[PDB]
Amino acid sequence: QVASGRAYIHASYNNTIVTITDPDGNPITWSSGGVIGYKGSRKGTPYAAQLAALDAAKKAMAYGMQSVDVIVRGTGAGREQAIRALQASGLQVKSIVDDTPVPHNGCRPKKKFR
Amino acid sequence: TMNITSKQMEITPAIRQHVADRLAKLEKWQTHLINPHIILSKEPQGFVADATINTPNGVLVASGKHEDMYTAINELINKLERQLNKLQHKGEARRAA
Amino acid sequence: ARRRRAEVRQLQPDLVYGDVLVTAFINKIMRDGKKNLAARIFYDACKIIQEKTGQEPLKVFKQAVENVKPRMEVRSRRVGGANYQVPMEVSPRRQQSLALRWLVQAANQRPERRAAVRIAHELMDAAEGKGGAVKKKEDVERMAEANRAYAHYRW
Amino acid sequence: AKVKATLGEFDLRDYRNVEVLKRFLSETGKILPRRRTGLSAKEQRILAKTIKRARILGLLPFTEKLVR
RNA sequence: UGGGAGAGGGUGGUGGAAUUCCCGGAGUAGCGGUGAAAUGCGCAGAUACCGGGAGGAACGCCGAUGGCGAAGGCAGCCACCUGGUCCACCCGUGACGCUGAGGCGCGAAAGCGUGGGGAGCAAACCGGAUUAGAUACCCGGGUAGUCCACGCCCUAAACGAUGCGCGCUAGGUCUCUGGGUCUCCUGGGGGCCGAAGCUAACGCGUUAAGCGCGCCGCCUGGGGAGUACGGCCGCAAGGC
Ligand SMILES: [Mg+2]
Ligand SMILES: [Mg+2]
Ligand SMILES: [Mg+2]
Ligand SMILES: [Mg+2]
Ligand SMILES: [Mg+2]
Ligand SMILES: [Mg+2]
Ligand SMILES: [Mg+2]
Ligand SMILES: [Mg+2]
Ligand SMILES: [Mg+2]
Ligand SMILES: [Mg+2]
Ligand SMILES: [Mg+2]
Ligand SMILES: [Mg+2]
Ligand SMILES: [Mg+2]
Ligand SMILES: [Mg+2]
Ligand SMILES: [Mg+2]
Ligand SMILES: [Mg+2]
Ligand SMILES: [Mg+2]
Ligand SMILES: [Mg+2]
Ligand SMILES: [Mg+2]
Ligand SMILES: [Mg+2]
Ligand SMILES: [Mg+2]
Ligand SMILES: [Mg+2]
Ligand SMILES: [Mg+2]
Ligand SMILES: [Mg+2]
Ligand SMILES: [Mg+2]
Ligand SMILES: [Mg+2]
Ligand SMILES: [Mg+2]
Ligand SMILES: [Mg+2]
Ligand SMILES: [Mg+2]
Ligand SMILES: [Mg+2]
Ligand SMILES: [Mg+2]
Ligand SMILES: [Mg+2]
Ligand SMILES: [Mg+2]
Ligand SMILES: [Mg+2]
Ligand SMILES: [Mg+2]
Ligand SMILES: [Mg+2]
Ligand SMILES: [Mg+2]
Ligand SMILES: [Mg+2]
Ligand SMILES: [Mg+2]
Ligand SMILES: [Mg+2]
Ligand SMILES: [Mg+2]
Ligand SMILES: [Mg+2]
Ligand SMILES: [Mg+2]
Ligand SMILES: [Mg+2]
Ligand SMILES: [Mg+2]
Ligand SMILES: [Mg+2]
Ligand SMILES: [Mg+2]
Ligand SMILES: [Mg+2]
Ligand SMILES: [Mg+2]
Ligand SMILES: [Mg+2]
Ligand SMILES: [Mg+2]
Ligand SMILES: [Mg+2]
Ligand SMILES: [Mg+2]
Ligand SMILES: [Mg+2]
Ligand SMILES: [Mg+2]
Ligand SMILES: [Mg+2]
Ligand SMILES: [Mg+2]
């Protein structure tokens, strides 16, 4: 049991994954569009991200989590609705920062990004 | 089934069977050919082969003309194929976005 | 239509309870413009409601209407290359229309021989939360909830 | 609110002027556009190069996480 | 002589972001992917998260309708070596000039040879979809290659589809870069709109496709055909 931790929102166009860690970044629990029951492209809807964030927040609070910092990566649909679901869950959102990785012009991307 | 009208001409059961064998090229697309109807007729410049066919995805209406009657029939088929292949694939075009 | 909205036809109140909703119910029962028959079947059932259950026909009939009103429904829409059952809220006009339609349709599924018996009994059950009518409203609502994930396509 | 107007004289080649150079960086760490710095073409090039040297020395950052 | 701007070129070094992979930790029921899917990956512990390491390639913001080069083409940053170019002074030489058949050099990408390197990507290839079929488009894999050195190849929508040089013929507006006296003026670039004029039209118009002089290259109906034969070049592909 730890009361302070982190919430990562990995949110792509296909899915949204929420992992709740401790102060050091070690995962406590996690959820996703698949864990809340969806398959296929439904996992990339905002309601999907919503259920996933709530199911992740619920599990975390079951271990005494009360405060989280929120780290957000990716520009997926359910990104903004996932932040909502965390706030409106019971957890205390101490902060929200976007840590989306961006190359400083690095590796050549797959054909579909050119 | 399939009906064949020979307007102001006379044709044999052999020619009617040729038309049915040529219309069978449309069976390729594996869609329902619903009451296909071929009209054969002669202008002063050659023969005219008309056709009206409904399918689950629309209607086919085409007209072929040529001196040689079997060629007018073939021109009819060519126009009917391009119409059917359009009906069967046009909806695929805008899957994205 | 394309140019403008359509204006909802106002119905004259019926002559036994002064109700406009009771009128719309009669019309939904009416086949081939036999309104005399249509009214007689409803009222004949309003006696059966009274005689099998000692309370107000009007009240029983109206509660069964609220018990069939679907609050949400699915409305199809092709998105790219897939037909999606979009969950949608139902306008009160349409709620009423769906309620009355399903009542009669479900009543006429019944096994009871005389129609006014089928109209009475279905309105009796639906007043309590039973019958194939209320089932149809529940079924439609469960469809809408099942597809809440598509609720952002709503127009 | 253009950054150059918020500063007196400075040397556009002082790669160690951490406290002046840092104003020409967005809160996310990026080099700010000419529209938000108020420099001409010629001096924006000197600024960009100087910021880059200062980055390599560790004075200025290459990127910062965006905090809502 | 005194100045300037610049992704101009060559060599050695060097920085951070990101991807992938390997190790450690924490954690579990899916992840991924699409129009929707499936193949694929995952309880032999994947994805998502944190820490450490390895390695290659490309340099986000700045960055622009921008800059530089003869063209190809050139973009993190530092140093060295080095080319072109513009400006002010009007100091030196005294027509020393223009063009240029041949020649010589340069010449994107792909390709070739020898050696190295290989993260990502990805011809060929394999598999999943799509579809009437789908030797494709989309998806999951994947070898050459993409990268470096040296040597070849010598092509292109190598384009402004517009050879180079000079002189001449309204202006207006935006911009890069110099010199003034900094209002503005004046050089050199880069765009837009337009005087006269040109043009079959579209359009061009002091960055001419205008008006003229010089010199070079090239066209002479479509196909056959950039093919055949010859010759020259190339390791080959194939080029002229
Ligand atoms: Mg998905
Ligand atoms: Mg017949
Ligand atoms: Mg006949
Ligand atoms: Mg006709
Ligand atoms: Mg054919
Ligand atoms: Mg009805
Ligand atoms: Mg029903
Ligand atoms: Mg029930
Ligand atoms: Mg000098
Ligand atoms: Mg591990
Ligand atoms: Mg085990
Ligand atoms: Mg890591
Ligand atoms: Mg850019
Ligand atoms: Mg330019
Ligand atoms: Mg130039
Ligand atoms: Mg002199
Ligand atoms: Mg002299
Ligand atoms: Mg020359
Ligand atoms: Mg020559
Ligand atoms: Mg070459
Ligand atoms: Mg190459
Ligand atoms: Mg190559
Ligand atoms: Mg080979
Ligand atoms: Mg080889
Ligand atoms: Mg090689
Ligand atoms: Mg060999
Ligand atoms: Mg090799
Ligand atoms: Mg490999
Ligand atoms: Mg295949
Ligand atoms: Mg197949
Ligand atoms: Mg086959
Ligand atoms: Mg394939
Ligand atoms: Mg592929
Ligand atoms: Mg791949
Ligand atoms: Mg090979
Ligand atoms: Mg090889
Ligand atoms: Mg040549
Ligand atoms: Mg061009
Ligand atoms: Mg040019
Ligand atoms: Mg040419
Ligand atoms: Mg031509
Ligand atoms: Mg020439
Ligand atoms: Mg000429
Ligand atoms: Mg000027
Ligand atoms: Mg000045
Ligand atoms: Mg000019
Ligand atoms: Mg113009
Ligand atoms: Mg004129
Ligand atoms: Mg002329
Ligand atoms: Mg001008
Ligand atoms: Mg003039
Ligand atoms: Mg010019
Ligand atoms: Mg011309
Ligand atoms: Mg010829
Ligand atoms: Mg040849
Ligand atoms: Mg050739
Ligand atoms: Mg030969």
Side-chain angles (χ1 to χ4, degrees), chain A residues 2-23 25-93 95-114, chain B residues 1-66 68-97, chain C residues 1-3 5-46 48-52 54-58 60-82 84-147 149-155, chain D:
Chain A
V2 295
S4 242
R6 283 154 156 156
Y8 291 81
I9 297 169
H10 182 270
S12 76
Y13 315 91
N14 275 321
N15 198 350
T16 306
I17 298 182
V18 190
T19 295
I20 315 287
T21 72
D22 67 13
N26 296 322
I28 296 305
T29 196
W30 70 277
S31 188
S32 81
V35 196
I36 57 95
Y38 291 165
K39 288 182 178 55
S41 61
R42 288 161 84 103
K43 310 190 297 195
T45 68
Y47 186 71
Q50 182 176 314
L51 301 183
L54 298 173
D55 174 74
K58 196 163 315 307
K59 291 164 178 175
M61 288 180 313
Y63 296 180
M65 184 90 59
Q66 295 174 335
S67 178
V68 306
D69 303 294
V70 170
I71 300 88
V72 183
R73 297 190 181 113
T75 80
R79 158 158 109 171
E80 217 51 51
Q81 186 58 223
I83 305 153
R84 303 305 199 273
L86 293 182
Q87 301 172 312
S89 73
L91 285 168
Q92 185 189 322
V93 284
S95 51
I96 299 162
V97 17
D98 180 293
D99 200 16
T100 290
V102 36
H104 298 0
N105 222 33
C107 309
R108 172 187 272 246
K110 288 162 143 291
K111 174 191 175 171
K112 69 175 182 179
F113 299 114
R114 305 179 59 257
Chain B
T1 82
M2 181 214 50
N3 287 97
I4 294 175
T5 301
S6 178
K7 172 164 173 176
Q8 304 178 268
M9 316 189 323
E10 293 301 332
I11 58 184
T12 58
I15 295 169
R16 303 184 176 266
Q17 185 51 56
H18 173 76
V19 171
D21 288 340
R22 287 329 221 103
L23 258 188
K25 289 180 69 183
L26 294 182
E27 289 180 1
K28 211 212 314 164
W29 281 268
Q30 294 176 45
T31 194
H32 186 185
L33 290 164
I34 314 191
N35 294 321
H37 183 13
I38 312 310
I39 294 95
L40 297 188
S41 31
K42 174 152 172 47
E43 291 180 9
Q45 281 95 9
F47 293 76
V48 180
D50 291 323
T52 79
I53 309 176
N54 192 48
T55 63
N57 286 5
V59 291
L60 314 170
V61 172
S63 190
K65 288 186 194 166
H66 197 271
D68 188 300
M69 186 201 62
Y70 300 92
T71 307
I73 292 153
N74 280 328
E75 194 171 84
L76 170 62
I77 301 296
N78 276 285
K79 303 176 188 268
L80 285 185
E81 282 169 322
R82 130 165 288 197
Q83 288 190 28
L84 182 55
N85 188 78
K86 189 169 191 183
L87 291 193
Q88 298 299 108
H89 301 323
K90 190 185 174 200
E92 307 161 15
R94 301 295 192 88
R95 278 175 166 172
Chain C
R2 297 202 196 261
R3 288 188 173 282
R5 299 155 136 268
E7 81 302 348
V8 187
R9 268 187 226 277
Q10 312 300 312
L11 307 176
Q12 219 223 257
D14 80 306
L15 317 181
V16 181
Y17 303 78
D19 200 357
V20 288
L21 178 60
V22 162
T23 300
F25 191 81
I26 308 252
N27 301 140
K28 288 312 296 164
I29 307 188
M30 180 171 38
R31 313 228 240 274
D32 299 325
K34 286 189 162 196
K35 189 173 237 300
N36 212 45
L37 180 52
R40 271 220 260 175
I41 297 168
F42 176 75
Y43 294 131
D44 241 20
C46 302
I48 302 183
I49 284 187
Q50 128 77 9
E51 291 216 357
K52 289 212 57 49
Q55 69 295 295
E56 304 284 65
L58 177 91
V60 167
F61 162 84
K62 286 189 146 307
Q63 179 74 208
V65 165
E66 308 302 298
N67 282 19
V68 190
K69 291 182 167 192
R71 301 190 285 278
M72 303 276 265
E73 72 177 340
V74 286
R75 279 188 133 177
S76 272
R77 176 177 180 180
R78 223 174 65 84
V79 197
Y84 280 144
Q85 293 274 252
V86 189
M88 281 272 273
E89 60 277 34
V90 202
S91 73
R93 159 80 152 120
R94 182 168 155 80
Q95 290 196 33
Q96 243 187 55
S97 324
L98 299 193
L100 304 169
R101 188 182 306 152
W102 292 335
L103 253 333
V104 194
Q105 266 170 359
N108 289 252
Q109 307 279 249
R110 282 188 149 251
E112 0 284 349
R113 300 194 155 178
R114 289 186 307 182
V117 175
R118 290 194 308 278
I119 307 306
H121 283 178
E122 181 58 28
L123 291 168
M124 294 214 297
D125 280 358
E128 300 181 326
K130 306 185 296 187
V134 178
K135 160 182 197 177
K136 173 62 176 178
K137 157 235 143 73
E138 292 171 348
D139 278 358
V140 165
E141 284 187 332
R142 159 170 51 258
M143 249 295 166
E145 187 62 24
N147 295 94
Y150 297 140
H152 58 291
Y153 295 162
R154 58 193 181 276
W155 59 91
Chain D
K2 300 190 187 319
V3 174
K4 182 199 180 187
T6 92
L7 288 156
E9 272 188 56
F10 47 76
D11 187 359
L12 288 165
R13 303 175 174 166
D14 188 296
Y15 47 88
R16 294 188 296 160
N17 208 330
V18 182
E19 273 290 325
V20 179
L21 289 179
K22 74 172 194 176
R23 327 184 72 148
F24 297 86
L25 292 171
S26 76
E27 78 176 50
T28 213
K30 300 212 241 305
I31 294 185
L32 287 166
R34 263 181 57 191
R35 66 178 185 81
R36 276 201 35 77
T37 68
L39 280 84
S40 52
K42 159 164 191 172
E43 44 193 49
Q44 181 82 356
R45 297 194 296 278
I46 308 176
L47 168 75
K49 178 165 288 286
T50 288
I51 294 185
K52 285 165 179 168
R53 303 177 156 191
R55 285 167 146 164
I56 299 175
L57 274 98
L59 315 172
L60 296 178
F62 290 97
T63 184
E64 292 300 336
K65 331 191 179 200
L66 179 75
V67 188
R68 292 251 200 281

